[PDB]
Design a protein around this ligand. Sequence first.
Ligand code: HEM
Length: 390
Amino acid sequence: GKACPYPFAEMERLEIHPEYNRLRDAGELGRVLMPYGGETWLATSWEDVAKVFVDPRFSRSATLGKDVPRVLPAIQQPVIMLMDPPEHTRLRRLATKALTSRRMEALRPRTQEVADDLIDKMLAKGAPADLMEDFALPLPIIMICELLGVPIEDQTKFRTWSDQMLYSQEVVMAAGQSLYLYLSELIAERRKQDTNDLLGSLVRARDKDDRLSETELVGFAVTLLIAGYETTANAIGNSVYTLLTHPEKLAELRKDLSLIPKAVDELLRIIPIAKQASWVRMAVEDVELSGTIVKAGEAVAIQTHSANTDPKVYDHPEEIDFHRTSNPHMSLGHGAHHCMGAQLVRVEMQTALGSLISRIPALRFAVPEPRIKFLRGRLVPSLEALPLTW
Ligand code: HEM
């Protein structure tokens, strides 16, 4: 047992274990033992982490139903993000035609209404309130629903199931099938009314004579929903808790808002998007990675935080600066698996702070900052409550 047990981290708050920044600033490649599957390499530098996303000598296809190192015991499922060419660069090519940077910016108007909408009842109801449930937690579902085309009537019955996928199996997989068949149904309707919708234009999207089949269509559909619900809530709620930890940095925004774009990529990079590392990638060829030489069939996991705070790429890398002349962060990913939610995450977080920071200037923690509790759950860090007062 050269390799330390990965059960080493803790998601107490938005803290990261020091190993990541010792390994980066010394041992190119570090080795740790995952509780399930074997042991695995741990890339931590900007250099290596960038590579693990982009190097075709790193298959993620070759993880479908394999005994690979991991943190969960569930063995993952043919998804856009466990594919590789030519299947991935075909699926994603067809989808990106419907899920354009245009369509997602055109959502900004609606997204305004919805933030305004939420602080409105949130203000109306009286302080103290709790932003996770009260405003950040729904904003992104209401925005995902609008994107796909989920009609107003079915909207509150969508949240029914979409939140039944967290607490049993005879209700989550009920909620599974209940949402598969609901979406497959809804797509059928967009083929009838060939809309200016996203489900509308995924059908109508064709590369030469290629098209998405019922199970690629529904499969892609459902994947947005899971990608964009729980991680846009947590992008927001945390980013606030952080912004509120640096009042220095609020006033700079509050009494200036031309920086909302630049401050979001900033607030992303600085904040860990997960409590553990990533979904271990598999070397299909021998590739020297950050000094050490990953043998083919050997596994490696990317930590983004350490990449995003690499003193080799970021000057003053642990201070928050909204004036950074350039921000090549990894929080939203790199290469041909660039987050396709990207444009929407930016227009959501911008206008969500864009609003809150103005519409509630004197918005402050209700309870001592130390006393705010985080979920002892898993995957990415979540806020039990974000109790605020005004
Ligand atoms: C709001 C709607 C969102 C949608 C619809 C969405 C969808 C996706 C999809 C489909 C991918 C995989 C792309 C591919 O392999 O072809 C992706 C990647 C990614 N998304 Fe999102 N996303 C969203 C928001 C976010 C947010 C808020 C975060 C916050 C951290 C995030 C983090 C990531 C990361 C890190 C990747 C890297 C993919 C990889 O290399 O494995 N996404 N997103």
